[PDB]
Amino acid sequence: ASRLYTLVLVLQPQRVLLGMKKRGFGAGRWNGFGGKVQEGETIEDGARRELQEESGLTVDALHKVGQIVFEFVGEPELMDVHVFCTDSIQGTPVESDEMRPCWFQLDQIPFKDMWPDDSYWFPLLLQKKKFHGYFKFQGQDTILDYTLREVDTV
Numbered sequence: 001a002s003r004l005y006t007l008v009l010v011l012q013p014q015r016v017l018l019g020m021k022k023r024g025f026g027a028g029r030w031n032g033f034g035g036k037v038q039e040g041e042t043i044e045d046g047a048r049r050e051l052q053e054e055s056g057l058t059v060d061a062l063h064k065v066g067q068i069v070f071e072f073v074g075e076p077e078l079m080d081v082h083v084f085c086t087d088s089i090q091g092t093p094v095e096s097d098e099m100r101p102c103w104f105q106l107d108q109i110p111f112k113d114m115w116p117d118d119s120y121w122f123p124l125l126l127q128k129k130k131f132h133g134y135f136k137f138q139g140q141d142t143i144l145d146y147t148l149r150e151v152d153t154v
């Protein structure tokens with residue numbers, strides 16, 4: 001019982017682009033760009049589409065970097081999140097009524113204002129590692145348990 005999602009991190013050598021969601025799921029937190037995958041759409045095309053819809057950026061090359069399954073206790077649907085990374089983009093990040101994008105220096109990533117799981121896997125992403133993860137949450141702030149391992153193939 002899992003639903004596909006995408007998550008894209010525009011990660012350059014000294015900085016990463018994050019977006020502050022204004023409403024809905026995860027509002028008030030800095031996050032990568034993504035959302036649900038459409039019927040008849042590949043996960044990668046879904047990731048490219050969501051990056052444009054949410055950030056206004058056009059991605060050329062996308063690299064798979066991780067897979068993370070999220071469980072929210074009491075919610076039937078598991079989120080199967082396919083994480084991607086890019087250093088090659090076109091355009092300038094667009095602020096919209098839904099999203100406020102901002103570039104962060106790598107030593108200044110706002111972990112306290114991000115989903116709690118990011119403190120676990122962002123260190124791997126920053127060191128160009130690939131990973132498989134699972135996080136069980138109680139509500140939106142508490143991680144009850146988790147698993148996270150590095151992999152050669154996502």
Ligand SMILES: CNc1cc(=O)[nH]c(=O)[nH]1
Binds near residue numbers: 007031032
């Ligand atoms: C539930 N955890 C996460 C959801 C999401 O959209 N992005 C994260 O980094 N983590």
